[PDB]
Design a protein around this ligand. Structure first.
Ligand SMILES: *[C@@H]1O[C@H](CO)[C@@H](O[C@@H]2O[C@H](CO)[C@@H](O)[C@H](O)[C@H]2NC(C)=O)[C@H](O)[C@H]1NC(C)=O
Ligand code: CLR
Ligand code: NAG
Ligand code: NAG
Ligand code: NAG
Ligand code: NAG
Ligand code: NAG
Ligand code: NAG
Ligand code: NAG
Ligand code: NAG
Ligand code: NAG
Ligand code: NAG
Length: 1133
């Protein structure tokens, strides 16, 4: 083994040295060079480390690595072979085999005058295969942020002219101003005149350099690339449903035809109860006090229980508690509580054009969208600074953004967190205004930094001539997707919108601090609303917009329903007693039910919004049945009055009917104890139902009687009219309603198929105020970013190997997410992840850093490591040490010094084994619809299952958690399918069982009433999934009420028809329905007559425009079916 040089001699040019000629054997490297050799040329680091280089040469090699690193650092395999080319030249103990000195000159030591010899030039015999592999591993590497190949910057020519041998030739030519002296390469896989070319093994860009150094990426490599995604599923059925409906229709038609052809070819208990009731009445018919006294008692119980009208309604608790939805939210809290909320603005520049700007030294045309005009950025910065300076007052105190913001690096840094493109310029007008240029070029400006910072937002030093940091003033990177909108692919320069985001404390556990934050928010909303700049359109996130709009909009419409309620109760008042006899009752009846309900609920605590539309419209049941019992008696007139004339007309039609009506109602509201977020309003009303029932018992009858004994004339006429109507109805049924009845069946059939073959969750569409609209419009337009978090809490974490396995799970999750997409982009996640396992690794790779104590004090630097061999081991496993260091950070360590810390961990003392709870979050955009977010949530749950299902263990111990400002809120829209089927199902049983608690005709009554259950439902669904309909936490309650009123109708028509004393074919039926038809047109008609004022009327928002919309449609359909349904059933019988 022999050298050609050893050590450094004279200056060549600049700061550059020739090496000293030396032709002896290699020399063991001093221990003081072991770090350098381990770092640069670890292949030589064994035995006596006998090399043809000294420590000075290795230091010089390290110092010269800056420019290759500048362009190749991202692809370690590419850089590795290059380093080996230089290591072999500099240090190989067999230099003489592949190097031949070709020029020299004297070196004279200035002090001793001893002569040595500069190696001025030499020839280097490089393997052909080595050179080609070195080029091959680097040829796809892309410059840090640039569609140009890194080799175009290291080859003295463009990448399309760069080849393996001319690249090496260029690097080795002193003319390049970097190489200290020229090395002339000769490329051969064969010996050349006894020289044995350097042909060291090489690594491709698809290979790992070592155990702690991964292969190169796709973006910077070719070998390790592909394949894209191919898991797209395409479903689409439905026609089947249509065919079935059609088939059914055909069958029906056939049946009808057949029928036509044929015609051409040819109880005790109940009674007893009634009797008892009558007896009671007769007794009661001997005193008014008792009754009223009872009403008075109810006046108290109702009002009494209403003590402390604390009937809350806020804030966002309707998904109900318990289960996973709530339990999951609570869990994430104990670990961190409320991650926090964001006030967010989207900003566009409608009066500004795009523009071009060549960035040195490429000079390629890069277009920049309207909002990235330099002047609009200055204007957006002024907006931003003004927002930071907003103050609100609460009590006598002042509230700033600095009091409520996420300031991640407090106290050492109170700097608030503002996600904005202006934070790439540290929110500084001057810094952004800067621009290093001369008479010839602009070398660096607000463009270069931008194009660099979108690729390296954590950088504390632009690689351009500006040398400005990218890191935001809050101490963390601002990711480009989260601050720009309306750009294509990752061409952030083409953005048509800026997004500005301020995280502020939600203060879920602190009431006094939350109120202060909400005071600030109100000022923020005001500031934005009144901000004047023709150059910018600014639009909303906040908090009140969604909470203030609902409480600010939902009011005017009140006057609508209110009015309608009055005009309706007026008619129902005129109807029967007309005068001041019936009015009193009702007013008391409606009050009793409403008052009683509030009292029944006060004994358990509860409250709600829709709980009002139900309470009011629900009261109808009490009025309807109550409005027909009195009317029927009015139509009475025999040998008796008051005495038996009241018990024979009351305990005869009111006993059974009412008795059955009250039950069918209590069964729908009573059994409302189910599982969901509506049982409260439900039960409360159902309870108010028996109450309202027992009320109108002796109260209405007695009162109506006690007092019942121009106005008279009017009553008679109405009665007469009713009678006439009944007669007409009878006549109609007499003819033949078989054809139309079949047609009706068709309508129901078509409805079931059209209603069962549509569906939907529920979106958010509030009135057109302003704020809310802005946020809704901005969201629709924007895209790519704006977020929620998927999040896991994990336990244990102590077995180096289980951490490696958990990291593989984590990396795999990042992949699927960055893949799963839809239409023209991903849907699932976003997405990507920054747990921490990578931070530790980074630390291991590198080194220390300075911490500067606040306000003053000497600098503190402290740390260490642990390479080379150990380095790989340390990073591989163990974790207490790393963990306790990694949690305490706030100043990088290398070429700069910034902040790169976080949170989520919280062990005790130095028990690193007890660490919790690491949390990884990938924010994904959506804002599509109630069904869109629900679909994404559905995917995330399966993602959580897949990760937890992959590698589990013992029983239970934490799992996946998808907490996104949309869950708990949409969590309900999840089990909506089971709810509807379960909710209605529970009523179908309570109704079929109740209607039998005083009958049990097997198929007679059972089917009669049972048919009404599916009869009306198909209508409600049709209108909902058919025309102007909807569905949600309310619609579900809507369907419930529908089945309720429906039961009411049927109940009366049927309890008196089924029996039928003097029985017949279809004659007795027409007789019963007659006395029941008059009431069907009274309450029903009126009720509709009221909705119209509510439905046919107007409003200032679609909100109720639907709620009270279907009501009238669904309520109307049910009423119509009442008469038809009964008639059809009778005929069938
Ligand atoms: C160039 O290749 C040679 C031959 O593989 C490397 O020398 C070997 O290095 C390993 C790793 O330390 C030792 O185990 C062998 O004993 C060495 N063999 C010989 C013949 O010396 C050398 O490390 C490579 N050069 C560089 C810079 O990595
Ligand atoms: C202009 C760009 C492409 C140059 C990129 C390659 C540079 C970094 C290369 C070209 C020639 C190389 C030098 C070749 C010879 C020596 C002598 C050695 O005893 C110390 C290292 C040193 C000084 C090398 C450092 C790296 C070097 C300067
Ligand atoms: C000069 C000198 O020390 N040479 C030794 C050599 O004898 C030995 O074989 C080798 C083993 O690694 O270590 C070196
Ligand atoms: C051997 C020789 O050339 N002599 C020189 C001498 O003239 C000079 O004064 C000295 C400076 O230190 O360097 C030596
Ligand atoms: C482009 C790439 O992946 N690497 C190339 C390879 O395709 C080619 O076969 C080889 C031949 O020299 O050069 C290298
Ligand atoms: C476009 C380009 O750079 N072509 C050069 C070619 O002129 C040169 O002869 C060859 C030497 O290997 O390298 C390549
Ligand atoms: C989940 C959570 O952290 N809850 C906290 C509780 O620990 C603390 O005692 C209380 C003090 O006001 O505020 C709340
Ligand atoms: C408008 C603005 O950005 N700057 C104001 C400044 O003029 C004022 O003095 C300060 C109150 O001290 O509030 C801030
Ligand atoms: C305008 C006003 O209310 N000023 C009062 C001040 O007089 C009082 O001393 C202080 C006590 O904290 O609260 C504030
Ligand atoms: C059947 C089975 O898998 N049992 C294992 C048990 O051997 C192990 O000690 C434990 C550690 O938590 O996990 C479980
Ligand atoms: C080195 O190669 C050159 C030709 O390039 C030759 O003239 C010289 O004699 C050789 N010296 C040695 C030691 O091989
Ligand atoms: C879940 O992972 C399993 C393998 O464990 C895989 O077969 C399936 O395609 C994955 N599904 C989703 C939705 O990620």
């Amino acid at each position: 083994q022999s050298c050609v040089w050893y050590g450094e001699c004279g200056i060549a040019y600049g700061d550059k040295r020739y090496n000293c000629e030396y032709s002896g054997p290699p020399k063991p490297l001093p221990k003081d060079g072991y770090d350098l050799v381990q770092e640069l040329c670890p292949g030589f680091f064994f035995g006596n480390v006998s090399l043809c280089c000294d420590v000075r040469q290795l230091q010089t090699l390290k110092d010269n690595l800056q420019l290759p690193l500048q362009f190749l650092s991202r692809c370690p395999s590419c850089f590795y072979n290059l380093l080996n080319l230089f290591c072999e030249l500099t240090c190989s103990p067999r230099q003489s085999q592949f190097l031949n000195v070709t020029a020299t000159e004297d070196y004279v030591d200035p002090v001793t005058n001893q002569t040595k010899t500069n190696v001025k030039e030499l020839q280097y015999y490089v393997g052909q295969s080595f050179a080609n592999a070195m080029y091959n591993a680097c040829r796809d590497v892309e410059a840090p942020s640039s569609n140009d190949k890194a080799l175009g910057l290291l080859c003295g020519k463009d990448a399309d002219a760069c080849n393996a041998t001319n690249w090496i030739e260029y690097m080795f030519n002193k003319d390049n101003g970097q190489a200290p002296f020229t090395i002339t390469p000769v490329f051969s896989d064969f010996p050349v005149h006894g020289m044995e070319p350097m042909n060291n093994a090489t690594k491709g860009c698809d290979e790992s350099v070592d155990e702690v150094t991964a292969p190169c990426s796709c973006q910077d490599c070719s070998i390790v690339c592909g394949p894209k995604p191919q898991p797209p599923p395409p479903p689409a059925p439905w026609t089947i449903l249509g065919l079935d409906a059609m088939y059914v229709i055909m069958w029906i038609t056939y049946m009808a035809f057949l029928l036509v052809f044929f015609g051409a070819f040819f109880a005790f208990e109940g009674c007893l109860r009634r009797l008892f009731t009558r007896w009671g009445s007769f007794c009661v018919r001997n005193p008014g006090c008792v009754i009223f006294f009872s009403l008075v008692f109810i006046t108290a119980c109702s009002s009494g229980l209403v003590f402390v009208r604390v009937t809350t309604n806020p804030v966002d608790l309707w998904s109900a508690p318990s289960s996973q939805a709530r339990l999951e939210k609570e869990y994430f809290d104990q670990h961190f509580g409320p991650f926090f909320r964001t006030e967010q603005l989207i900003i566009r520049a409608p009066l500004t054009d795009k523009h071009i700007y060549q960035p040195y030294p490429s000079g390629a045309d890069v277009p920049f969208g309207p909002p990235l005009d330099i002047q609009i950025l200055h204007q957006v910065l002024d907006l931003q600074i003004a927002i930071e300076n907003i103050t609100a007052s609460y009590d006598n105190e002042t509230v700033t953004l600095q009091d409520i913001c996420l300031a991640p690096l407090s106290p050492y840094n109170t700097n608030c967190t503002i996600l904005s493109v202006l934070n790439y310029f540290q929110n500084s007008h001057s810094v952004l205004d800067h621009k290093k240029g001369d008479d010839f070029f602009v070398y660096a400006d607000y463009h270069t930094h931008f194009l660099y910072c979108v690729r390296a937002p954590a950088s504390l030093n632009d690689t351009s001539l500006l040398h400005d940091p990218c890191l935001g003033t809050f101490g963390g990177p601002v990711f480009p997707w989260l601050v720009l909108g309306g750009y294509d692919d990752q061409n952030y320069n083409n953005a048509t919108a800026l997004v500005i985001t301020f995280p502020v404390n939600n203060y879920y556990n602190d009431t006094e601090k939350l109120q202060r934050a909400q005071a600030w928010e109100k000022e923020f909303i005001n500031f934005v609303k009144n901000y004047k700049n023709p150059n910018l359109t600014i639009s909303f996130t906040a908090e009140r917009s969604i909470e203030d709009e609902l409480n600010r909009e939902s009011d005017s419409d009140v006057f609508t329903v209110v009015i309608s309620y009055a005009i309706m109760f007026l008619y129902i008042s005129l109807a029967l007693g007309h005068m001041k006899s019936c009015r009193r009752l009702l007013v008391d009846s409606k009050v009793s039910l409403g008052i009683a309900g509030i009292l029944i609920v006060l004994s358990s605590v509860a409250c709600s919004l829709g709980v009002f539309s139900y309470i009011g419209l629900p009261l109808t049941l009490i009025v309807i049945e109550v409005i027909p019992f009195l009317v029927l008696a009015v139509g009475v007139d025999n040998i008796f009055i008051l005495v038996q004339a009241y018990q024979r007309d009351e305990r005869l039609q009111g006993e059974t009917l009412d008795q059955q009506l009250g039950r069918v109602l209590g069964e729908v509201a009573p059994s409302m104890f189910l599982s969901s977020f509506s049982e409260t309003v439900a039960f409360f009303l159902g309870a108010l139902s028996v109450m309202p029932a027992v009320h109108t018992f002796s109260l209405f009858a007695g009162l109506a009687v006690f007092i019942d004994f121009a106005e008279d004339g009017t009553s008679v006429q109405a009665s007469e009219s009713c009678l006439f109507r009944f007669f007409k109805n009878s006549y109609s049924p007499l003819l033949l309603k078989d054809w139309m009845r079949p047609i009706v069946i068709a309508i129901f059939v078509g409805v079931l198929s059209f209603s069962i073959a549509v569906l939907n969750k529920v979106d958010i569409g509030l009135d057109q105020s302003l704020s809310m609209p802005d946020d809704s419009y901005m969201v629709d337009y924007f895209k790519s970013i704006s977020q929620y978090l998927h999040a896991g809490p994990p336990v244990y974490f102590v077995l180096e190997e289980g951490h490696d396995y958990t990291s593989s799970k984590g990396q795999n999750m990042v992949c699927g997410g960055m893949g799963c997409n839809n239409d023209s982009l991903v849907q699932q996640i976003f997405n990507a992840a920054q747990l921490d396992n990578y931070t530790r690794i980074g630390f291991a790779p590198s080194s220390w850093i300075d911490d500067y104590f606040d306000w003053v004090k000497p600098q503190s630097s402290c740390c260490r490591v642990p390479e080379g061999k150990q380095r790989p081991q340390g990073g591989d496993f163990m974790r207490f040490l790393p963990m306790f260091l990694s949690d305490n950070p706030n100043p990088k360590c290398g070429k700069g010094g910034h902040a790169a810390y976080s949170s989520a961990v919280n062990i005790l003392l130095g028990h690193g084994t007890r660490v919790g709870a690491t949390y990884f979050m990938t924010y994904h955009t959506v804002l599509q619809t109630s069904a869109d977010f629900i679909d994404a949530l559905k995917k995330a749950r399966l993602i959580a299952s897949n990760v937890t299902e992959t590698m589990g263990i013992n029983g239970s111990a934490y799992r996946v958690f998808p907490y996104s400002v949309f869950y708990v809120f949409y969590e309900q829209y999840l089990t909506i399918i089971d709810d509807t089927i379960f909710n209605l199902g529970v009523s179908l049983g309570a109704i079929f069982l109740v209607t039998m608690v005083l009958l049990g005709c097997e198929l007679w009554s059972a089917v009669i009433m049972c048919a009404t259950i599916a009869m009306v439902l198909v209508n409600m669904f049709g209108v909902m999934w058919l025309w102007g309909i909807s569905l949600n936490a309310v619609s579900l309650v809507n369907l419930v009420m529908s089945c309720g009123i429906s039961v009411e109708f049927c109940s009366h028509i049927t309890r008196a028809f089924t029996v039928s004393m003097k029985g017949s074919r279809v004659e007795r039926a027409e007789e019963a329905l007659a006395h029941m038809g008059s009431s069907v047109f009274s309450g029903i008609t009126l009720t509709k007559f009221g909705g119209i004022v509510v439905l046919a009327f107007a409003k200032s928002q679609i909100f109720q425009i639907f709620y009270f919309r279907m009501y009238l449609a669904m309520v109307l359909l049910g009423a119509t079916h009442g008469l038809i349904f009964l008639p059809v059933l009778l005929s069938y019988i």
